[PDB]
């Protein structure tokens, strides 16, 4: 298993108001330029949220949600500072509850 860090918000906020996939795209391009393995992803309606270890987060989460996920904690620290209205946390994967850290429930 590896540890995944996440910032979770509503689709309203992260897909429409502040389409964060814009910032992710420029980060992906810069990673490419530097020959760096991409270690961050946007996941819409993430399946990880149904894991028992994340019950507290699911209990507070928007009905229609989306996560920025990374194996680099630093990045998620900055995503939280950048967006602020996001829940944050971490999980280990793959596991029984989270067989695919990047899977969507849609």
Curated annotation (Swiss-Prot):
Domain of life from the UniProt record: Bacteria
Family: Belongs to the ycf54 family.
Protein name: Ycf54-like protein
Source organism of this protein record: Synechocystis sp. (strain ATCC 27184 / PCC 6803 / Kazusa)
Full-protein interval shown: 28 to 133 of 133
